[PDB]
Amino acid sequence: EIVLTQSPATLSLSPGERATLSCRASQSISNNLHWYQQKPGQAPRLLIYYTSRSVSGIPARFSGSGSGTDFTLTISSLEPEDFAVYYCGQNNEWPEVFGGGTKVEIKRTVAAPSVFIFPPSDEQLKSGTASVVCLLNNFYPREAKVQWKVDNALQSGNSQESVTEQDSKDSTYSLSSTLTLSKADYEKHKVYACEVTHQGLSSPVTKSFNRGE
Amino acid sequence: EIVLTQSPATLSLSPGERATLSCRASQSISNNLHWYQQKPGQAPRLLIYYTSRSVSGIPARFSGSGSGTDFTLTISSLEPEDFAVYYCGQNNEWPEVFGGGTKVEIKRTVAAPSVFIFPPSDEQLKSGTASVVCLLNNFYPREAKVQWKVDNALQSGNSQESVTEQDSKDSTYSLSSTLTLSKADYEKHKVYACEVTHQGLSSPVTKSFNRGE
Amino acid sequence: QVQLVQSGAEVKKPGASVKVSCKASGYEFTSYWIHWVRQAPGQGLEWMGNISPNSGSANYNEKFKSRVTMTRDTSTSTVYMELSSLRSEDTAVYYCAREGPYSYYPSREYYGSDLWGQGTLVTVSSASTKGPSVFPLAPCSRSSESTAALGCLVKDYFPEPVTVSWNSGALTSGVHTFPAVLQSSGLYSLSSVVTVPSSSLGTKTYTCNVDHKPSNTKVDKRV
Amino acid sequence: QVQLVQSGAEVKKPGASVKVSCKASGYEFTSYWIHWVRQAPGQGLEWMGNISPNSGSANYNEKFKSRVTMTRDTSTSTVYMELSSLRSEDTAVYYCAREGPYSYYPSREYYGSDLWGQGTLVTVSSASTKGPSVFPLAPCSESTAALGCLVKDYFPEPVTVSWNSGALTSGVHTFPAVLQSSGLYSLSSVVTVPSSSLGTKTYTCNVDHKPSNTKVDKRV
Amino acid sequence: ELRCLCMKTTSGIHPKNIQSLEVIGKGIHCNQVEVIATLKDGRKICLDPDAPRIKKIVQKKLA
Amino acid sequence: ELRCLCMKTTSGIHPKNIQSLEVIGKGIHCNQVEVIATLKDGRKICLDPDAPRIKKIVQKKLAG
């Protein structure tokens, strides 16, 4: 089965700039390579089919090319509506295969997150559960490592993360990590900490509290 | 249908030299192009089949090549037995088609012909016909112009030429031109002449007789 | 109108089966292949298979072959996809897409999928309708840095969605309402945060407004 | 011995028909196509058609389709070509050639014609068998002299010429025959001799025309 | 073959116009039987794999 | 096709081994009927165009 490799995974540019997206096929697929756009909350949309052929309803700024196993999508000048995810897709053979996608995001300066920790509420503790929340506020780029350390023990499999879409005003991201324990487990320990690693930080930032204080 | 065009019509080379023969197809014939040799008095002989494949009983010096509609036959070093006619033939589609042929002749120095004229014999004259013969002996190259003039009147369509095959010993050609008249027509004139034009002659040579002598 | 209209969102227990429909309109049904493509949360696209509107015969991805059935109904111009032995990994948006127009001439040159359905969210959970518990998010100490963060933890609700506003929609600057996460329990959880100046914490009031229409839950929580 | 043996030379009047045979020996008859290729005097090659010795199915050139029939006989390993409504333009050497070996595997890659018959000369003419008249060619000074003999008005081809019963070969040129408007052939054979030899030495040309059973010895 | 070549089939072609016909059985990448006819004009056309109709053209081609 | 592709034919092949079959009628460049079978291994093979047995293998491919 064909493997379609898209590069880069993330393309960070400014509106008005030209965008070049790449797709490499593991073996030949003739010219049966097509391009799709997907916006958050919407169905994919066909932009270019059969390597370079035009699609009804699609603006002129989109064009494609590709020789052999190498294919390219070009957006001559990025409009605000073009910051989305783009997939290449082959149908030369079944099963049909799509690339992993390329996210086209708004470029901005590296910004370290403002980190905040929240202990569980007494109201939640009375219910028999403890959620500890770590907030990484308005940072750039999206890549960030959040680690939960309970009395110096690294936590795994007891937390979930959620990230916002890129902010419309300042082009930053925000992330929350929630650690969930039983009241019994929570009361066995004192120090609760989230350690944050990000490009905008020279060394990892740690926010913590001691249970009961 | 398919038209196969061979070039040149004549290739003049020395024994030991390399020979390159060309064949051009009007349309595609895949690689289903074959090479044949023909010697005077013999049936054609297959040398190369399927553009470049070797044939049982054929010497190593013969090889072929060809991309698309252009094909080539190479004789790496000409042997005395290689001076013959060569045909290309396609069998990709029916009807099978052959090229017009390429004659490979021995190259030699320019040699002017020795010209001889022969009046009709009395024995022929008693039959009621008169053949006047002009002989061009051992000349090179093959191209020669013979012109019959009867009392200064240029003759056309009442004569036939015959040329020998290239001589095995001295690589020259010989040509006879025969002018045929009725006894009645022949007896109405006095001067019978053949004017010979050839590369080895600085000016045209004229041989003649008067019907009186 | 040229469209592919899919059936509504589905909630299913693990081990159960789901049948999603895709209704075509405004075009020649018999002239386009119908594909089924899925997208798991935060992931790429995955082709499941396709069906022919002419023969009613389907081609499947080997990955799904053992528990997928695609069928068509020419009388209604509708294609169906049935997925069985449902597991957490099957929680995804399921898309139908047409590929054509093709005639009675065979080809080795193909069109892309030029028209997609709106998608059908399929959630694989054993939960029943449940309103959320709303907890405050406040720092351990009311101290020091010029900026403070407050929030609301909207926990253990089912199904989606929940809407959150701050001060009845009056507060929008500095607000981040995170997409919900589906927990191991099969229930959702989200948080909504706001960044405010530290000088405000004694003077200004901050209330998060939580609405969960499926359980008819309305909560206003001052933090 | 691997060979294609064709039937002998033929003389036919215009409007008549000719049937040429080609007998295969030493190889698998059903494994090779049998083509019929003709060559008009001094010209190139022209494919007439073929016949599968396996199926007996014949394929013809559209140019000949209306007056050609190709058939095969398995019992004798022989193929035949019949050409009808004969005209002057049909005068040629007719060859049979095999193309193969082919099996039950279809292909779009083909062999050439690796084995040809000796050919069959077919002469079409209103003219009838006629022996030649042999005339001397003699001059009316230079160290070298030329003499010869004119072999005129014979039909059909061929004629053989030698000088002094084959003893004289040096300086001899026997020209290919020409077809005259009369439908009869004519050729000349010449020899270059030293002038000292004229009247000292004898020169006789030996002419043989086997179709009319003519043998002539002419002293020049 | 790496996928199905025939989508839509036709009928209404006179056998006199068909040069050849290819019957393709179900394969690893195509779960449908396909019938491709090459017409005398050279056009390739997908036919309904209806066994009686294709068997009539097939007998008429061999006779 | 531009000439006859089949010289010899075979009769011994199980339909289980045939992937596809091409029935070629007589044409402008071929005065023969030809039946070419593509085997499951990929090999192309000429079959005897006898109408009953060709229709047996054809029907079995043309259905199941």
Q: DSSP assignment, residue F2?
A: -
**Neighbouring chains to E with at least 3 Cβ pairs closer than 8 Å:** A, C, F
Q: Which residues of C161-198 are buried (b: 16+ CB within 10 A; e: fewer)?
A: ebebbbbeeebeebbbbbebebbeebbbbbbbbbbbee
**Helix then strand then coil, % of chain C, to nearest 5:** 10, 50, 45
CB atoms within 10 A of CB A159: 19
Q: How far is CA D22 from the centre of its chain?
A: 16
Fold of B4-106: Immunoglobulin-like (2.60.40)
* Extended strands (E) in D17-139: 18-25, 33-39, 46-51, 58-60, 68-73, 78-83, 92-99, 115-116, 120-124, 133-137
* CB B200 within 8 Å of CB B190: no
* CB C195 within 8 Å of CB C151: no
Consecutive H or E run containing D110: none
Pairwise CB contact (< 8 Å): E29 & A91: no
Method: X-ray
Tell me the shortest Cα–Cα distance from A199 to chain C, in angstroms. 22
Long-range contacts of C211-214 (CB under 8 A, 24+ apart): C211/C162, C211/C163, C211/C164, C212/C131, C212/C132, C212/C157, C212/C162, C213/C161, C214/C129, C214/C158, C214/C159
Phi and psi (nearest 5°) for B122?
-60, -40
Give me the architecture of the B114-210 domain, per CATH.
Sandwich (2.60)
Cα separation, B70 vs B3, whole angstroms: 12
From A206, A213, A212, A211, select the one nearest A148 (Cα to Cα). A206
Pairwise CB contact (< 8 Å): F45 & D106: yes
Cα separation, D85 vs D87, whole angstroms: 7
The answer to whether residues C14 and C94 belong to one domain is yes
For residue E30, which residues of chain A lie inside 8 Å, CB to CB? 94
| D111 near B CB under 8 A | yes
From B42, B165, B29, select the one nearest B95 (Cα to Cα). B29
From C19, C32, C116, C111, select the one nearest C77 (Cα to Cα). C32
Tokens of F11: 């009769």
What number of CA atoms fall less than 13 Å from residue C32's CA on the CB side?
Answer: 26
**Alpha-carbon torsion angle D196, D198, D199, D200, nearest 10:** 40
Tell me the shortest Cα–Cα distance from C66 to chain E, in angstroms. 15
> Pairing mode, if any, of strands C33-39 and C181-182?
unpaired
Position C190: which residue type?
A: L
Pairwise CB contact (< 8 Å): C105 & E43: yes
* CB D90 within 8 Å of CB D125: no
All residues at 6 or more sequence positions from C28 whose CB lies less than 8 Å from its CB, including other chains: C101
Cα separation, A181 vs D72, whole angstroms: 96
Cα separation, D32 vs D41, whole angstroms: 28
Q: Which residues of D40-74 are buried (b: 16+ CB within 10 A; e: fewer)?
A: eeeebbbbbbbbbbbbebbbbbeebeeebbbebee
* CB B104 within 8 Å of CB B17: no
Consecutive H or E run containing D167: none
Three-state SS at C31: helix
Consecutive H or E run containing C195: strand C188-197
For residue E3, which residues of chain C lie inside 8 Å, CB to CB? 59
To which residue do tokens 């083909």 refer?
D110
Nearest CA in chain B to D96: B43
* CB A187 within 8 Å of CB A146: no
What are E's interface residues with A at a Cβ cutoff of 8 A?
A: 2-4, 29-30
Pairwise CB contact (< 8 Å): C178 & A176: yes
Tell me the shortest Cα–Cα distance from D68 to chain F, in angstroms. 15
The answer to whether residues D138 and D194 belong to one domain is yes
CB atoms within 10 A of CB B154: 9
Pairwise CB contact (< 8 Å): A94 & C59: yes
Q: DSSP assignment, residue D14?
A: T
CB atoms within 10 A of CB A151: 12
The answer to whether residues C162 and C62 belong to one domain is no
| E63 near C CB under 8 A | no
Pairwise CB contact (< 8 Å): C106 & E6: yes
Tokens of A4: 């379609």
Tell me the shortest Cα–Cα distance from C16 to chain A, in angstroms. 26
**Alpha-carbon torsion angle B87, B93, B95, B101, nearest 10:** -10
The answer to whether residues D58 and D83 belong to one domain is yes
- CB neighbour class for B44 (10 Å; exposed up to 12, middle 13-18, buried from 19): buried
* CB B150 within 8 Å of CB B190: no
From A188, A132, A126, select the one nearest A158 (Cα to Cα). A132
To which residue do tokens 């980190």 refer?
A115
Task: Give me the DSSP letters along A14-30.
Answer: -TTS-EEEEEEESS-BT
Q: Which of D124, D148, D173 is the last residue of a domain?
A: D124
Residue C96, CA distances (Å) to A36, B146, C20, C55 in order = 14, 87, 10, 18
Q: Do chains F and B touch (3 or more CB pairs under 8 A)?
A: yes
The answer to whether residues C73 and C147 belong to one domain is no
Instruction: List A residues 10-69 in contact with C (Cβ-Cβ < 8 A).
Output: 30-32, 34-36, 43-46, 48-50, 55-56
For residue B92, which residues of chain F lie inside 8 Å, CB to CB? 2-3
* Extended strands (E) in B97-184: 97-98, 102-106, 114-118, 129-139, 145-150, 153-154, 159-163, 173-182
Three-state SS at D196: helix
* CB C209 within 8 Å of CB C151: no
**Alpha-carbon torsion angle A105, A109, A114, A120, nearest 10:** 10
Tokens of F41: 């291994």
Position D208: which residue type?
A: D
Cα separation, B141 vs B201, whole angstroms: 12
Listed in order, the ranges of chain A carrying CATH 2.60.40.10 are 4-106, 114-210
The answer to whether residues C57 and C118 belong to one domain is yes
**Alpha-carbon torsion angle A22, A26, A27, A32, nearest 10:** -40
For residue D27, which residues of chain F lie inside 8 Å, CB to CB? none
For residue E3, which residues of chain A lie inside 8 Å, CB to CB? 91-94
To which residue do tokens 């569980």 refer?
A120
Pairwise CB contact (< 8 Å): B123 & D136: yes
For helices E51-62 and F51-61, the axis angle rounded to 10 degrees is 150
Tokens of B34: 């074959």
Question: What are residue B131's DSSP bridge partners?
Answer: B180
Phi and psi (nearest 5°) for D169?
-130, -25
* Extended strands (E) in C100-174: 115-116, 120-124, 133-137, 147-157, 163-166
The answer to whether residues C162 and C108 belong to one domain is no
| C59 near A CB under 8 A | yes
Tell me the shortest Cα–Cα distance from A93 to chain E, in angstroms. 5
Residue D58, CA distances (Å) to D53, D62, D97 in order = 9, 12, 14
Residue C197, preceding peptide bond in cis (omega within 30° of 0): no
Cα separation, C50 vs C46, whole angstroms: 12
For the beta sheet containing E34-39, the strands, ordered from the edge strand earlier in sequence to the opposite edge, are E44-47, E34-39, E18-24, F18-24, F34-39, F44-47
Cα separation, D75 vs D77, whole angstroms: 6
Where are the alpha helices (H) located in chain B, listed in sequence order?
122-127, 183-186
All residues at 6 or more sequence positions from B16 whose CB lies less than 8 Å from its CB, including other chains: B77, B78
Cα separation, C159 vs C178, whole angstroms: 16
Task: Give me the DSSP letters along chain A.
Answer: ---EEEE-SEEEE-TTS-EEEEEEESS-BTB-EEEEEE-TTS--EEEEETTTEE-TT--TTEEEEEETTEEEEEESS--GGG-SEEEEEE-SSSSPEE---EEEEE----BPPEEEEEPPPHHHHHHTEEEEEEEEEEEBSS--EEEEEETTEEP-SSEEEEEPPPPTTT--EEEEEEEEEEHHHHTT-SEEEEEEE-TT-SS-EEEEEETT-
What number of CA atoms fall less than 13 Å from residue B16's CA on the CB side?
Answer: 0
Total structural domains within chain C: 2
* CB E57 within 8 Å of CB E15: yes
The answer to whether residues C174 and C91 belong to one domain is no
Tokens of F58: 């054809």
Pairwise CB contact (< 8 Å): E7 & C108: no
Q: What angle do CA C94, C100, C105 make, to 5 degrees?
A: 140
Mutate to test the interface with F, among D27, D104, D107, D111 (most CBs of F within 10 A): D104
From E28, B21, B176, C198, select the one nearest D190 (Cα to Cα). B176
Cα separation, D116 vs D110, whole angstroms: 17
Looking at chain F, the number of H-run helices and the number of E-run strands are 1, 3
From D177, D69, D180, select the one nearest D126 (Cα to Cα). D180
Q: DSSP assignment, residue C120?
A: E
Tokens of E38: 């090459």
Pairwise CB contact (< 8 Å): D139 & B116: yes
The answer to whether residues D22 and D71 belong to one domain is yes
For residue E58, which residues of chain F lie inside 8 Å, CB to CB? 23, 51, 54-55, 58
Three-state SS at F26: coil
* CB A95 within 8 Å of CB C50: no
From A133, E44, A142, A145, select the one nearest C109 (Cα to Cα). E44
Q: What angle do CA D42, D44, D46 make, to 5 degrees?
A: 130
Tell me the shortest Cα–Cα distance from F43 to chain E, in angstroms. 14
CATH code for position D158? 2.60.40.10
Domain ranges of chain E: 1-63
Cα separation, D52 vs D98, whole angstroms: 10
Three-state SS at D102: coil
Domain extent at residue D111? 3-124
End-to-end CA distance of chain B: 59
Final resolution, Å? 2.3
Q: Which of D72, D102, D124 is the last residue of a domain?
A: D124
Pairwise CB contact (< 8 Å): C106 & E46: yes
Greatest distance between any 2 Cα atoms in chain D? 75
The answer to whether residues C79 and C165 belong to one domain is no
For residue B91, which residues of chain F lie inside 8 Å, CB to CB? 3
